Design a protein around this ligand. Structure first.
Ligand SMILES: [Fe+3]
Length: 52
């Protein structure tokens, strides 16, 4: 349930919440996001998130 933060915009990916409108149900770990997922607030890539 390790949260990750976007280092562009500060958005926090929270595995307990997922990202439904991008097809990520609640409970999905950050490491299991789809290869094409990007930060939903700013568009940044997953390579620019850090553990939070
Ligand atoms: Fe972002």
């Amino acid at each position: 349930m390790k949260k990750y933060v976007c280092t562009v915009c500060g958005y926090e990916y929270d595995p307990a919440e997922g990202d439904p409108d991008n097809g990520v149900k609640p409970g999905t770990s950050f490491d299991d996001l789809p290869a094409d997922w990007v930060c939903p607030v700013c568009g940044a890539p997953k390579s620019e998130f850090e553990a939070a």
